[PDB]
Write an enzyme that holds these catalytic residues in place. Structure first.
Site, short mmCIF file in Angstrom:
data_model
loop_
_atom_site.label_atom_id
_atom_site.label_comp_id
_atom_site.label_asym_id
_atom_site.label_seq_id
_atom_site.Cartn_x
_atom_site.Cartn_y
_atom_site.Cartn_z
N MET A 77 0.93 -1.19 0.09
CA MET A 77 -0.09 0.05 -0.01
C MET A 77 0.77 1.14 -0.02
SD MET A 77 -3.35 -0.91 2.34
CE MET A 77 -2.53 -1.61 3.60
N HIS A 78 0.24 2.26 -0.24
CA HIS A 78 0.67 3.71 0.05
C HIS A 78 1.84 4.28 -0.95
CE1 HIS A 78 -1.72 3.22 3.41
NE2 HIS A 78 -0.72 2.35 4.04
N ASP A 233 -2.68 -4.95 -0.03
CA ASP A 233 -2.41 -6.41 0.36
C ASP A 233 -3.17 -7.03 1.61
OD1 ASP A 233 -0.89 -4.71 2.11
OD2 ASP A 233 0.96 -5.24 1.05
O1 LIG Z 1 -0.14 -2.72 5.99
C1 LIG Z 1 0.14 -1.66 5.07
C2 LIG Z 1 -0.24 -0.37 4.86
O2 LIG Z 1 -0.92 0.06 6.42
C3 LIG Z 1 1.78 -1.96 4.28
O3 LIG Z 1 1.52 -2.76 3.14
C4 LIG Z 1 2.67 -2.88 5.37
O4 LIG Z 1 2.15 -3.57 6.11
C5 LIG Z 1 3.40 -3.95 4.50
O5 LIG Z 1 3.99 -4.69 5.35
#
Ligand SMILES: O=C(CO)[C@H](O)[C@@H](O)CO
Ligand SMILES: O=C(CO)[C@@H](O)[C@H](O)CO
Ligand SMILES: [N+]
Ligand SMILES: [N+]
Ligand SMILES: [N+]
Ligand SMILES: [N+]
Ligand SMILES: [N+]
Ligand SMILES: [N+]
Ligand SMILES: [N+]
Ligand SMILES: [N+]
Ligand SMILES: [N+]
Ligand SMILES: [N+]
Lengths: 475, 476
Positions: A77-78, A233
């Site tokens: 993410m992000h 994910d």
């Molecule tokens: O869960 C997230 C977003 O908050 C990220 O993708 C991390 O967890 C990867 O490990």
């Protein structure tokens, strides 16, 4: 036949799901991560792709494709992916675990005082928006050339289809989403000096975004199969597992501790570590919280005790003797440290191991309680990852937490399974969503022992007091 | 020849010394303890006798006692034995490790403002005086019948001799004794509604209080031999070890940890957790403090780290990773000891852990001695005995940490029974000097502080003390 892709941080995994829930084939390719200055965590989109491409073919060459009717994506993410007008990468992607942009989180929240309300989230340096404030402040030559910003999995979608598209679960992670409304916030975008013009289009995870390009479809040994929106994910993971409706939840006991809980509609506690996002299905939202990593902590405890392994550690814990008083183990995820409190002459490596198991459990339980306090009430919780493997410790965890804990088969495939399921959904329009959301097979179920639960509660009070008292010492 | 008897808590031990002062034979008999309620610790004084009888009979099988010339006793301190006017045992003995009378301890100190000045001690529930207030308050029917209060070894004496007598070292432990004056304190006794008539006669340890009764002598296969006053177990122990003059000090890293130092006359600093009593010799006084059982700790650090033996351990610790940040072990002295492992990281395994234990126990012990010294004790050396004392590495570490010369000796095994016999020797050989009859144990090795390692330890001691204090309230 269906295809799921997971764009991870450590690498890409691709699978082949059967009409049934069986995974037929799987390929995995490694990614590296880059750190060219401090607090920086970067990858290049081209490597995402090259790895993904490489994987799909490894996959092709393991079992036949072109029976495949649909393909779904998930990913980390992000991540900020910046594209110029030619769709060329402006700079390396700025990842979820990047920490360069703290000051910018501040300004952003100051520009939009209602940001916590709009997004349902605490702003973090790993979220997408503030990364963009950082570029415009520091790499302005780069900022000016931005035609689009994609999340990592959506970069892959671009390469795959030629479309610009995201799903609600991912987009929720940008801080440009009105999470309640399942749509962009013009307020948040402007404040970053961006417009919807520069966002991808928004879909539910089960919805079709396009189809493979001919070239890509040829390269891969399959048709111009349809591509669905997919998910971030964690959400895609949850879809995989079957945790999809209100008050369903899963706890990850692997290297990367997370609690994920589907909410009854949208909820928020924006001044906490409890984050709130869209799910990767229509009309769903979830909470999630970073946790104590059980697997990491057990590994360390193993070495600390000299028991050289986790199974050995767990085995030993079972041998501990029951008349000895409680020792308390206090783990500090914060830099991976700890305390034993209450050691007596009666305490051997066995006792010590029991104390490690109980104290990790004390921490996990409190972490769950925090999520639940936001308005979630699970009937059971599904347990995944390496630390979920013991029957003894699952039972301990249930007794401590007071949750029914489910162990399932295949909980271990990851977001790629979720991505595949999302594809399967979209390819079966004739059927209702609710006929299309399998849970994984129930392998064992753990209900809490009432006496043991009751005996644990006071120990938990003690745990909390001691954790609290020593924290500033271990810091 | 000579006999020493030691009335312990968990058993009796009797020994036979030869003319040359060697142990020629020993015999032990077990004792139970009875805990009818939380905080209650009691024994039936009849069990003391039956145990002692058994033991002396067994001894005699091994070796004839017909050439014994004097007999000594030592005993678990502070036990309250209540007798009526017929020498009937009124209730079970309330032992040193009984904790039923905390309230009475406070009451007594309020009642006798100068109590700490007269006794040289802070009042503890294990001490005899508060025990009697409790009986008065909770068992008035019993109190009404009290003719005599005897310490445990002294009840033994009465059974053996028909006399009512104690020594200054045991008597000091009652809290009825004026420790400066080596005589009962009318103030302290009144405050408990007792009188001197309810106390035994006081002697010095090395003085004769009487002789075995004919019936007793006969049963045991001996002459109606003279009996000395003896000592409380600590003081008698000290006498056996040759701890005898001002500023002599011993640290016992045995199953029961003690620091015992002979003082320059009477020293009072009660505010405090140092105890001040008469010594079992004439014109001698001492300080004492309960210490960790370095023995029962080292053994634990071993099994804890799944190390096999006390030298596996001491060896693991030398493989400790120098570059690792410190683990801190904080041992809290309650026998009962509770420990904390503070500051553990990825860097730490059993070698580090084992190092932490040694150093932390070390740090505790050194602070323990410092406190006693601050009272006005200044040792040239500290005698170091007990099973905890066995490791050369650790003994040196203890010296480096403490800044103290530690004299390792062997033969602190025998216990208070040794000192008891030594006392009988004295009485039996009145022309001979104590130099003659009370020798130090064999000097095995003398440890001088390394100036470099001492300096290195000092900031760690400071850090330890800081941390120990911080968590202290959490240990209740
Ligand atoms: O869960 C997230 C977003 O908050 C990220 O993708 C991390 O967890 C990867 O490990
Ligand atoms: O530790 C002390 C108290 O002064 C000894 O009395 C032992 O308690 C047994 O005598
Ligand atoms: N590569
Ligand atoms: N088809
Ligand atoms: N600025
Ligand atoms: N096992
Ligand atoms: N001699
Ligand atoms: N006992
Ligand atoms: N007790
Ligand atoms: N009197
Ligand atoms: N006789
Ligand atoms: N202090």
């Amino acid at each position: 036949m269906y295809i799921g892709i997971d764009l991870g941080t450590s690498g890409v995994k691709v699978i082949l799901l059967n009409e049934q829930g069986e995974v037929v084939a799987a390929q995995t390719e490694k990614l590296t991560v880059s750190r060219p200055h401090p607090l920086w965590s970067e990858q290049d989109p081209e490597q995402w792709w090259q790895a993904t491409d490489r994987a799909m073919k490894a996959l092709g060459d393991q079992h036949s494709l072109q029976d495949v009717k649909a393909l779904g994506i998930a990913g980390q993410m992000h991540g900020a992916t910046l594209l110029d007008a030619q769709q060329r990468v402006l700079r390396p992607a700025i990842l979820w675990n990047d920490g360069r942009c703290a000051q910018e989180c501040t300004l952003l929240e100051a520009r939009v005082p209602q940001s916590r309300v709009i997004t349902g989230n605490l702003m973090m340096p790993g979220f997408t928006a503030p990364k963009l404030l950082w570029v415009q402040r520091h790499e302005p030559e780069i900022f000016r050339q931005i035609d689009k910003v994609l999340l990592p999995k959506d970069y892959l979608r671009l390469r795959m289809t030629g479309e610009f598209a995201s799903d609600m679960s991912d987009a929720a992670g940008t801080m440009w989403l009105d999470v309640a409304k399942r749509d962009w916030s013009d307020v948040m975008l402007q404040a970053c000096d961006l417009s919807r013009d520069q966002m991808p289009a928004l879909y539910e995870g089960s919805e079709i975004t396009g189809a493979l390009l001919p070239e890509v479809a040829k390269a891969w040994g399959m048709a111009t199969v349809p591509v669905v929106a997919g998910g971030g994910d964690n959400a895609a993971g949850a879809v995989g597992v079957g945790m999809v409706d209100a008050n369903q939840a899963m706890l990850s006991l692997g290297t990367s501790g997370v609690y994920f809980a589907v909410s009854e509609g949208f909820l928020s506690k924006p001044e906490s570590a409890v984050h709130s996002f869209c799910h990767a299905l229509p009309q769903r939202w979830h909470l999630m919280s970073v946790m104590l990593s059980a697997a990491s902590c057990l590994d360390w405890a193993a070495k600390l005790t000299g028991l050289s392994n986790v199974p050995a550690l767990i085995a030993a814990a079972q041998q501990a003797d029951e008349s000895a008083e409680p020792v308390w183990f206090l783990p500090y995820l914060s830099q991976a440290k700890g305390v034993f409190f209450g050691l007596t002459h009666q305490h051997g490596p066995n006792e010590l191991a029991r104390a490690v198991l109980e104290g990790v459990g004390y921490a996990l339980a409190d972490g769950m309680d925090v999520v639940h306090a936001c308005g979630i009430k699970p009937q059971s919780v599904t347990l995944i990852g390496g630390g979920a493997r013991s029957e003894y410790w699952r039972q301990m965890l249930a007794d401590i937490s007071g949750q029914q804990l489910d162990y399932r088969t295949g909980g271990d495939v990851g977001p790629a399974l979720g991505a595949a399921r999302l594809a399967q959904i979209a390819a079966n329009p004739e059927k209702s969503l609710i006929e299309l959301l399998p849970q994984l097979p129930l392998e064992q179920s753990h209900l809490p022992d009432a006496q043991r639960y009751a005996a644990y509660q006071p120990r938990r009070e003690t745990f909390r007091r001691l954790y609290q008292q020593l924290l500033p010492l271990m810091a």
